[PDB]
Amino acid sequence: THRFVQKVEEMVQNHMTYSLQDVGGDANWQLVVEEGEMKVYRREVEENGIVLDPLKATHAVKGVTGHEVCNYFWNVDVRNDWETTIENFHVVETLADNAIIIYQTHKRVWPASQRDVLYLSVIRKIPALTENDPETWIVCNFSVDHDSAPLNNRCVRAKINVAMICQTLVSEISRDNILCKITYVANVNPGGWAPASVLRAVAKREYPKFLKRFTSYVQEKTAGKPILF
Numbered sequence: 001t002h003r004f005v006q007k008v009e010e011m012v013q014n015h016m017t018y019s020l021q022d023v024g025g026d027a028n029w030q031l032v033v034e035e036g037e038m039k040v041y042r043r044e045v046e047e048n049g050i051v052l053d054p055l056k057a058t059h060a061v062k063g064v065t066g067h068e069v070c071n072y073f074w075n076v077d078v079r080n081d082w083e084t085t086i087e088n089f090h091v092v093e094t095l096a097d098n099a100i101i102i103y104q105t106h107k108r109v110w111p112a113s114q115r116d117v118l119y120l121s122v123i124r125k126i127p128a129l130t131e132n133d134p135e136t137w138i139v140c141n142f143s144v145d146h147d148s149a150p151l152n153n154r155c156v157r158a159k160i161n162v163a164m165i166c167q168t169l170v171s172e173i174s175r176d177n178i179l180c181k182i183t184y185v186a187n188v189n190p191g192g193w194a195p196a197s198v199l200r201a202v203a204k205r206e207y208p209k210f211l212k213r214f215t216s217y218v219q220e221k222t223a224g225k226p227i228l229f
């Protein structure tokens with residue numbers, strides 16, 4: 001039992017309560033980009049001059065399970081196969097077999113300075129709320145403080161709360177008959193000065209490119225392997 005067990009429970013339950021809700025019907029969410037079943041939405045939010053724009057996306061991916069998608073998203077050993085904006089990353093602390101603390105730096109977005117981030121990354125299976133409902137696999141990545149935080153004078157420290165939340169629908173089961181329903185939420189505080197139009201333009205381009213590249217990577221690596229439910 002590590003020191004972040006309560007915090008983890010809170011952050012995960014908040015996503016389970018609030019992040020799964022539908023936004024198709026909700027005019028407070030702007031639909032920014034659509035590519036088939038991938039639907040990317042945002043709200044435009046600025047606090048004390050800093051652009052926070054909550055991002056929420058849904059997607060439906062054939063032929064992979066939620067457990068698989070979450071394992072690929074959490075497993076630091078495959079990070080470089082799908083990430084494209086990371087410059088450096090270091091595992092700061094191992095809390096449990098399902099929870100680590102990561103420090104990473106990102107590629108600069110001109111003309112703002114580079115960003116770094118220091119977060120707890122946890123993977124959990126959440127049982128079905130009623131006998132009717134699906135089980136959920138979730139990865140939550142959320143900023144924390146740590147005394148071994150790196151000094152990096154080129155970087156402004158962002159703060160994140162991200163979740164990759166998956167429910168899996170199925171019909172001996174073939175990958176032909178499985179579909180993973182994803183909700184991805186990203187609440188990024190850039191942590192200092194950054195021009196709003198540029199941040200918005202980069203979010204609009206990069207979030208869809210990330211979701212497409214990541215989800216296709218999982219399909220590619222699990223093809224012709226036995227399913228892990």
Ligand SMILES: Cc1cccc(-c2n[nH]cc2-c2ccc(F)c(-c3ccc(S(=O)(=O)CCO)cc3)c2)n1
Pocket residue numbers: 085106107108109115117141158160162186188202203206207210
């Ligand atoms: C996916 C995406 C969308 C929009 C912009 C960018 C980007 N381009 N250049 C710098 C960044 C940047 C700056 C600060 C950050 F915290 C993250 C950040 C993004 C996602 C996540 S995660 O938790 O989804 C995946 C683990 O990295 C963590 C940090 C990314 N990347």
